[PDB]
Amino acid sequence: RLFKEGSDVKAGQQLYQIDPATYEADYQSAQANLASTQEQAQRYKLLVADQA
């Protein structure tokens, strides 16, 4: 818990960390898939201009 109790807080201020440890893993998997497909899309964007 990272707020002092009984105080005023603004919107968007973090309150607790709930130990992700699974969402971090699937986020790493999704980013690993993204790192392949975005450079494939960029290479196809470069090659589609010359009609290769």
Partner: protein, 53 residues
């Protein structure tokens, strides 16, 4: 007969040389496309070699 066959053979081989020049132009365009595709990184070196051959 000999002069006639020689003239017709030359007349055939002129257009055949034109078509072989068309083939060379087509293959040069294909090799340039595969060279672009190899420089970008989609194809391997082996497709470039097998187009050059």
């Amino acid at each position: 007969a000999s002069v006639a066959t020689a003239y017709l053979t030359l007349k055939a081989d002129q257009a055949q040389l034109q078509l072989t020049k068309d083939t060379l132009g087509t293959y040069q365009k294909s090799f340039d496309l595969t060279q672009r595709s190899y420089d970008v990184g989609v194809a391997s070196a082996l497709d470039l070699r097998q187009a050059q051959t």
